[PDB]
Design an enzyme around this catalytic site. Structure first.
Site, PDB file in Angstrom:
ATOM      1  N   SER A   1      -3.235  -7.373   3.615  1.00 59.02           N
ATOM      2  CA  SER A   1      -3.789  -7.356   4.927  1.00 59.02           C
ATOM      3  C   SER A   1      -4.289  -8.731   5.287  1.00 59.02           C
ATOM      4  O   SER A   1      -3.691  -8.800   6.578  1.00 59.02           O
ATOM      5  CB  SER A   1      -4.896  -6.355   5.143  1.00 59.02           C
ATOM      6  OG  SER A   1      -4.370  -4.872   4.665  1.00 59.02           O
TER       7      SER A   1
ATOM      8  N   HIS B   1       0.880  -1.224   0.078  1.00 63.53           N
ATOM      9  CA  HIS B   1      -0.177   0.059   0.065  1.00 63.53           C
ATOM     10  C   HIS B   1       0.862   1.241   0.041  1.00 63.53           C
ATOM     11  O   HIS B   1       0.458   2.341  -0.946  1.00 63.53           O
ATOM     12  CB  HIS B   1      -0.831  -0.002   1.267  1.00 63.53           C
ATOM     13  CG  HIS B   1      -1.936  -1.046   1.327  1.00 63.53           C
ATOM     14  ND1 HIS B   1      -2.338  -1.515   2.343  1.00 63.53           N
ATOM     15  CD2 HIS B   1      -2.424  -1.864   0.331  1.00 63.53           C
ATOM     16  CE1 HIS B   1      -3.240  -2.573   2.337  1.00 63.53           C
ATOM     17  NE2 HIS B   1      -3.422  -2.542   0.927  1.00 63.53           N
TER      18      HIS B   1
ATOM     19  N   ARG C   1      -1.183  -6.812  -7.012  1.00 61.96           N
ATOM     20  CA  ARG C   1      -0.285  -7.602  -6.446  1.00 61.96           C
ATOM     21  C   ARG C   1      -0.546  -9.180  -6.653  1.00 61.96           C
ATOM     22  O   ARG C   1      -1.546  -9.587  -7.210  1.00 61.96           O
ATOM     23  CB  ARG C   1      -0.347  -7.483  -4.908  1.00 61.96           C
ATOM     24  CG  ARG C   1      -1.407  -7.482  -4.223  1.00 61.96           C
ATOM     25  CD  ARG C   1      -1.624  -8.399  -2.853  1.00 61.96           C
ATOM     26  NE  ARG C   1      -2.900  -8.400  -2.349  1.00 61.96           N
ATOM     27  CZ  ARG C   1      -3.516  -9.300  -2.493  1.00 61.96           C
ATOM     28  NH1 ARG C   1      -3.538 -10.632  -3.110  1.00 61.96           N
ATOM     29  NH2 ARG C   1      -4.975  -9.399  -1.703  1.00 61.96           N
TER      30      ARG C   1
ATOM     31  N   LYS D   1     -18.486  -8.178   9.926  1.00 61.16           N
ATOM     32  CA  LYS D   1     -17.643  -8.478  11.046  1.00 61.16           C
ATOM     33  C   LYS D   1     -17.046  -7.214  11.848  1.00 61.16           C
ATOM     34  O   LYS D   1     -17.870  -6.664  12.534  1.00 61.16           O
ATOM     35  CB  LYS D   1     -16.359  -9.323  10.562  1.00 61.16           C
ATOM     36  CG  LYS D   1     -15.436  -8.315   9.910  1.00 61.16           C
ATOM     37  CD  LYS D   1     -13.960  -8.588  10.855  1.00 61.16           C
ATOM     38  CE  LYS D   1     -13.629 -10.156  10.561  1.00 61.16           C
ATOM     39  NZ  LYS D   1     -12.711 -10.426   9.048  1.00 61.16           N
TER      40      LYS D   1
END
Lengths: 156, 156, 156, 156, 156, 156
Positions: free
Chosen positions: D126, D16, D89, D40
């Site tokens: 992440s 990032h 990526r 969540k």
């Protein structure tokens, strides 16, 4: 801020022009770098290719056309820039583009940005346009009028 | 127990060495098979390509280098091996590698193991390395010194 | 030399078995690592999976079966090994597998090798076999006999 | 000349930050749009994520951080911009990104630029970072130190 | 000669209708199979989903609409057909579609023919169209009018 | 109803035959379009390819063979048809195929359907077959006996 939009542009298509427009809307200046290949190819000579780009982009005042030769990254930094914009269309060899982007970043610090061309222009390419046109197929909605003009001339 | 790593290695890169090292750590022996393509040349004659691979692999005592002839799977089985180890990088024609892996299994019972080369060597290929060296750019960090050594002479 | 074949094997398929057989012919020993994951609702319990794997692999004496918790790279090194062997079938998320492979090499030095599953078992997956089987379709030629036995039982 | 770099950033990684830097070098202003999901809740609350991004970009004076809600394109046009920059990526779901890019262009005139993050940062995400770190694995070279600090706290 | 076009059609899009038209042009008959999975929930119940497909395909006299139940190939064969027609768009999980096609051939002798949806409808999907509508955006040009009509009545 | 299966069929494989058989079970008639190619070297002369296709198709009475020149879409419409059926095998350049499909739809209203070749013949191609066979390899299980017959002769 500046970007380079490189290619052989033989001929420029409306997919290209769509990419030129998006680069010109997001950067202060854009250079279209015409990079001729070694092969005695292809169809139009260098002045014609320039002519076709110039004519198709008179509505983009912050864009100019230059002939390039050698490493794209050398040319880019020549224009005092550090960014390349490249269009993605169906049939794009994206893996090889990505390889080249990582090489170009590594050797000269130049960034490559990729942008998906609009759906309607997503299936033209210079080569496929030339093949189809010269066999009497109607690609005219996919190329600029300055290109359709010289294509028709070539037809005889 | 043994694996072959085939290629033209014109020249060998650090992407290749990366794969040799993974091959050599995980198999008892490794044979690097240099298969010269009748079409091209290439830039380096057979002897040079051998010397470069040898000189870049002295740290791997269980690896040896051989000139390969004819059907690849034939060469592999003549080495008594039934395994091929192949590197994956950015721009690898993986769909085609898969096809050949399946053909090779079918014709000679040879298995193909695919490995992702290390990210720092993921964008080097022999041909991109050559094109960029040819055009002035610097690829010395992505090639072993026996190569760079022979590259900067083969540019005078 | 040694390789680990990780997976949830819920249940083991002839795709897996093909991969096992191929790791076993090529590495000194193979460990099948059954990965319990907290807590992707499974079909068969841990020892059923162990059992099915064991019962489908009686022909491979250099292969053994273990449960893995946590990092695949921890399990691998726990076995005194440094290689993972993954099958590729139709529908494999190869890009995800590549991400994990690169991460796994970086955090623990472990190599991942990918092998194309035999064409006849290239379309089985534990997921799809379960879905098709539980709707009364015939997937039996795609799974080992020990698994087929258990599947008919659930069907009831 | 402005671009938005959108995402959940739970937590921001160096991949990032690589993207932020490149956006920041090529555009006059960059907004990192933190877009949360009514699901969540993730690992870090909004303040931690803002803070982590802020603390990791103190060297990019033309970048600011803002919470987003709703359509990415509405937020982009809120900032007075018409561009999005997004990293690629291994294995970015690129086809889904492309679909969204085409939808976003169609409904709002917003362009998306894709740029490949640096090879050393090309396997972090992440999710994977959080998975690996919490299981005791060393991802610290792949995350900014403000992120590493907070992960270490969670590992308590 | 007949084909099934299966789906959840929640709601049907012009991407779908494009595909129906192509199936209806190349096959004598064409059954649209609406299959509502257990986890169906959902922006439209079965009745409305039927109505929407019915109302969007009156121009296709050789197409008819039925509720699917259970194994997709069971339903296909029960219609006397051995052909599925599946549309391709940007973002389609083509690798999984391939897996399923091959499983489908294997279990029931059902062929799957894949067709690219028209570029203008190549980035719509049921879930994206909903997501965007839900957030306020305009997708009305990518959905047939019986859908658009009922879409506004969610938004009240 | 009717479909065209175009290709250079140099030589025809069982991969092709499988696709032929499947189009013939689903369309009223099929026409194999052997496309002349002014470039690509090629191995068998036009009449041999026709012969090999004819002899490998004696079992499909609703299939016939023709030579095509120029645009595939011209050939297709020439036959009173509007459909093309192409096989997908491992290694197919699907992206290129998709580009032509979109182009063909646009210049002529012709649809392209893709279908996955049977797994056992999913890795043959005319090119790979020729290369393997001319180096002494056994591809006989992957080609019709009429082709195996002619290939033996060339192997001289």
């Amino acid at each position: 801020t500046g970007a380079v939009c490189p290619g052989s542009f033989d001929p420029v298509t409306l997919g290209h022009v769509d990419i030129f427009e998006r680069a010109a809307a997001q950067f202060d200046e854009v250079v279209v770098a015409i990079l001729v290949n070694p092969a005695k190819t292809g169809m139009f000579d260098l002045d014609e290719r320039i002519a076709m780009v110039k004519e198709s982009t008179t509505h983009l005042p912050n864009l100019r056309v230059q002939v390039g030769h050698g490493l794209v990254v050398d040319f880019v930094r020549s224009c005092g820039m550090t960014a390349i914009v490249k269009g993605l269309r169906t049939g794009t060899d994206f893996e090889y583009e990505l390889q080249m982007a990582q090489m170009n970043k590594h050797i000269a610090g130049v960034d490559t940005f990729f942008v998906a061309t609009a759906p309607r222009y997503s299936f033209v390419s210079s080569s496929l346009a030339k093949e189809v046109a010269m066999l009497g197929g109607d690609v005219s909605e996919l190329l600029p009028e300055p290109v359709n003009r010289r294509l028709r001339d070539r037809l005889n």
